[PDB]
Every structure is written in structure tokens, then in C-alpha cells.
Amino acid sequence: TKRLDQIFVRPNPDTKRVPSTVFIHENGIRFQSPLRTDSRIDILFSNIKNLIFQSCKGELIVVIHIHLKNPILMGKKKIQDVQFYREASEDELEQEQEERRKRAALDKEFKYFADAIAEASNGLLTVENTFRDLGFQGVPNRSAVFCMPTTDCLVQLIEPPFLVINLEEVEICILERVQFGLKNFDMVFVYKDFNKPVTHINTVPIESLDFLKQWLTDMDIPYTVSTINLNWATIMKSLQDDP
Numbered sequence: 001t002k003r004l005d006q007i008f009v010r011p012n013p014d015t016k017r018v019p020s021t022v023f024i025h026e027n028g029i030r031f032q033s034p035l036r037t038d039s040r041i042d043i044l045f046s047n048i049k050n051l052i053f054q055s056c057k058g059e060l061i062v063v064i065h066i067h068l069k070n071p072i073l074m075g076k077k078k079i080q081d082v083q084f085y086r087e088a089s090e091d092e093l094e095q096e097q098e099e100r101r102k103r104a105a106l107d108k109e110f111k112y113f114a115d116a117i118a119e120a121s122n123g124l125l126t127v128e129n130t131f132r133d134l135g136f137q138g139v140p141n142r143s144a145v146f147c148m149p150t151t152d153c154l155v156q157l158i159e160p161p162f163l164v165i166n167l168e169e170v171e172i173c174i175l176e177r178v179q180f181g182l183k184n185f186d187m188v189f190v191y192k193d194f195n196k197p198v199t200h201i202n203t204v205p206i207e208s209l210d211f212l213k214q215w216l217t218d219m220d221i222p223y224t225v226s227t228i229n230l231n232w233a234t235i236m237k238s239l240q241d242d243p
Contacts, residue, residue, distance in 0.1 A: 004113040007084040009034045011160055022084055024120050035075040043072060043082065045121035050164055052150060053114040054130040054157050055107050061085040062106045064114050065157045067164040081162040128152055134215060136208045138201040147201060165189055165199060173216055173223045176230060185209060186229060194239045198232055
């Protein structure tokens with residue numbers, strides 16, 4: 001049985017951490033909930049919308065992240081995202097070379113397991129990889145974090161709540177608060193489903209604006225530039241009722 005040992009499962013808000021194993025079976029994966037009273041969690045391949053490998057490069061952990069089509073029960077909550085991670089951690093030079101070695105080994109181990117999940121899904125799943133070189137700093141929640149695209153998504157997987165935007169589902173991206181002086185701007189992702197709450201990524205370094213414009217265009221996502229922060233509460237209620 002293909003397995004990934006000694007990992008930790010998230011979401012885990014406040015339970016003492018306990019290493020566990022993810023096992024691959026005929027129709028999906030199974031693993032131990034980080035919340036003790038829960039009993040084994042099974043996720044069917046057919047319920048996985050995105051299977052993401054995120055390298056530990058520039059981060060403290062390596063990640064396999066699963067974004068679900070339908071929410072599953074775990075830790076008494078219905079959740080749409082589950083992930084497995086491990087933390088990346090003689091003379092000073094050798095200590096640094098060893099750390100690089102371990103980090104490369106960690107990425108390879110996690111990438112192989114993600115590949116084994118895709119293989120067992122018989123065509124259903126494709127491993128998406130985050131592209132660090134295309135990533136940018138921004139604030140979807142409270143802290144400044146690093147958002148990265150894959151071939152199909154824009155994600156933020158380090159700081160919960162985890163964010164997975166499927167690019168095919170985006171109606172438009174409005175770039176807000178871009179002005180003469182300012183050193184940062186705000187992004188709003190509007191989904192084609194107008195009942196879906198828009199996604200704000202605030203405080204993106206102004207120095208990334210041109211790169212994101214092109215990336216957006218490369219992903220066939222229309223954008224509009226705004227000097228101010230728009231309404232959204234108002235704006236969406238419009239599109240929901242009628243144009």
C-alpha cells in the first residue's frame with residue numbers, strides 16, 4: 001500500500017500534534033483526524049477538486065493540499081480543505097548543506113506521494129504545483145503571506161483559512177486602490193457564481209502590479225483597474241438581482 005508516513009494533518013486549530021500516515025486505497029485516501037475522537041477520515045478521489053503539491057522552498061513546511069468538491073466532516077466541522085505537511089526543521093557550512101539536502105529529500109518524498117495519488121485516481125486527478133517565481137505578497141486574512149498560482153489555481157496554503165481560487169471560475173479581477181503615490185494596492189476576485197462571496201487579497205506590493213496584470217492576461221482572466229476601493233456589498237447585490 002502506498003503511504004506517506006510521519007505527517008501532520010490540517011485544519012488543526014488547537015489540538016496537540018500527533019504524527020500520522022496517509023494511505024492510498026482503491027477509490028481514495030484515508031488518514032487519522034488530528035482530533036482524537038473523530039475516527040478515520042476517508043476522502044474519495046472523485047471528491048478532490050484540486051490536488052496540490054507545494055514545495056517547502058521559502059517556507060517552513062512542505063505541503064500536499066486537497067481542495068474538496070463537497071465539504072467533509074472533520075473535527076465536528078464541515079471543511080472544504082485538508083492538507084498534510086511536515087516541517088523542514090557539523091560546521092556551519094555543513095549544517096547548511098545538510099539542511100538543503102533534507103529539504104530536497106522532503107520535496108521529492110511529498111511530490112512522489114502526490115503523484116501516487118493522481119496515478120491511483122486513474123485519470124481523474126492531476127498534480128498541480130505552486131510556482132514560487134510567480135508568487136506575490138498579500139493579505140487575504142490578517143497577516144502578510146505569500147500567494148502562489150498553479151496551472152489552474154491561485155492559492156495560499158500556509159496560513160489558515162486556506163485559500164484556493166480556481167481560475168476557471170473567476171469572472172473578473174478588479175485591481176483597486178492603485179494611485180500615483182501609493183506603495184501597495186488591493187485585488188478583488190469576482191466569481192462567475194455571483195452568489196459566491198468575492199475574494200479580497202489586500203496590500204499587494206505595487207512593484208508586483210505589472211507582473212500580475214500579465215499573469216492575469218496569460219490566464220484569460222479579464223481585469224479592470226480602479227483608483228479606489230469599490231463597494232462589493234452593494235456591487236454584488238446588483239449582479240445578483242439584475243443587470
